[PDB]
From a paper:
Fibroblast growth factors and their receptors (FGFs and FGFRs) play a critical role in many physiological processes including embryogenesis, wound healing, inflammation and angiogenesis as well as adult tissue homeostasis. Compelling evidence also implicates activation of FGFRs ([name]–4) in pathogenesis of several developmental syndromes and a broad range of human malignancies. For the analyses of inhibitor sensitivity, we focused on a structurally well-defined kinase domain (KD) of [name], with the gatekeeper V561M variant and Y563C variant (corresponding to the replacement found in FGFR4) generated in the context of [name].
TKI258 binds more tightly to the [name] KD V561M (Ki ~ 35 nM) while binding of PD173074 (Ki ~ 1580 nM) is greatly obstructed; structural insights highlight the underpinning differences. The total number of van der Waals contacts for WT [name] KD and [name] KD V561M are 28 and 37, respectively. The total number and strength of van der Waals contacts for TKI258 in [name] KD V561M increases (with Sδ and Cε atoms from M561) compared to V561 in WT [name] KD. Thus in the gatekeeper mutant, the polar charge contribution of K514 and two water molecules are void at the binding cleft leading to a stronger affinity of TKI258 to the kinase. Direct comparison of the WT and V561M [name] variants in an in vitro kinase assay shows higher activity of the gatekeeper and a 6-fold increase of the kcat/Km ratio for ATP. As first suggested for SRC T341I, the valine to methionine substitution in [name] leads to exclusion of water molecules and a re-arrangement of K514 side chain potentiating the hydrophobic spine (that now includes M651) and facilitates coordination of ATP by K514.
Author numbering: 458 to 486, 490 to 580, 591 to 764
Amino acid sequence: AGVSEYELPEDPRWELPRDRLVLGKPLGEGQVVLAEAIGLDKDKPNRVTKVAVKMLKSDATEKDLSDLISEMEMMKMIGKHKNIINLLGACTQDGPLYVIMEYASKGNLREYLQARRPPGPEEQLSSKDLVSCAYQVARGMEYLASKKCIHRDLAARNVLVTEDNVMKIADFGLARDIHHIDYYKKTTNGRLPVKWMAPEALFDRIYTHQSDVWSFGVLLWEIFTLGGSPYPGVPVEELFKLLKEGHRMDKPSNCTNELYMMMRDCWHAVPSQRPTFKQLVEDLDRIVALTSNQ
Ligand SMILES: CN1CCN(c2ccc3[nH]c(-c4c(N)c5c(F)cccc5[nH]c4=O)nc3c2)CC1
Ligand SMILES: [Cl-]
Ligand SMILES: [Cl-]
């Protein structure tokens, strides 16, 4: 097929033999599939680990390859954290590139939240559990900011949830060209990504840790609305006009004034005035401690 024009250098720190990998069902679309890995840890060769594997489609170009490589190398550099999707290994030699990453069995946080809305098929979440989820997501972002990583698309759809209900930030290492970002393309739930972007990111294409903090304000809103859709019915130009006039979303029905205040602070018009992720981690810690299970 032409796969591939260049040569991939080997990296013994991360390489896994291809036959140690037992590929399973598609998880999403580069496409990500569930797989079983035999002997991921080279001191325990007879255990399988469920993992997710990212790979190129048959249609891919040298550019897609380069992008996937960039994400893998960024992930090597950023190192490990409980609340991000971690690099586990890679198959780079003698065949298609496979990037092996942590598997989150309950899927993305948006659907996870929606599936637990009171009926009108699992159980409802307590206030404490919602705040704990915000807290975990903030800890992940604080780790990434400390490693000088700007996410640029933080949203519930890019938070994954493990078997053990651990929140893990995903897709922080993607290489995208913000200038070819089409404001009109929609997500696969049908929503417009532009609704998570800070105004200076939106209008001026300036991406900072402060604009990530704006996005985290929107994610908080998602959490306390149980996976609700920001600015429903609103198209891109009307959104621009809302933001230019200083509109901010209403306080979700079940949500304390302290948490809504946290949201509004994340949405400060002056970026320097927004809290940092470190501050959010401390505030959410205290609030988790003061929130009832019941
Ligand atoms: C009934 N249940 C619904 C939720 N279920 C589910 C659905 C989709 C899912 N995608 C991932 C997943 C990624 N998409 C992913 C990535 F795109 C990059 C890096 C790591 C990744 N890890 C993942 O674990 N997990 C999923 C679980 C399992 C079945
Ligand atoms: Cl590490
Ligand atoms: Cl979404």
